[PDB]
């Protein structure tokens, strides 16, 4: 044969997908907003009371 | 400091028992005058 031509490179588009994880923890821990009047990085201590005995 | 008013809930409780048993309410104008005492016959033998 001896075709002597021109060689390339291909780099195709397909991903090979490898991670795929779960987090069932955090789906079950629930979520909050802190009702904070000024957005500031201080001290984000928010108070809520705890029920009466 | 910012208190919420979102109650952490903390207790739960459950009375079987008191749920279960009977419950009896006497005439008050007469347990009054009977020392808060009343009788109740046995079935005879």
Do not use: F, H
């Not at 069932?24 to 000024?38: E, N, V």
């Amino acid at each position: 044969a001896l075709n002597e031509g021109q060689i390339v490179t291909l780099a195709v588009d397909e991903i090979i997908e490898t991670i795929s994880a779960i987090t069932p923890m955090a789906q079950k821990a629930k979520k909050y907003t802190p009702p904070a009047a000024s957005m500031q990085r201080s001290s984000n201590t928010i108070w809520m009371p705890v029920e009466q005995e």
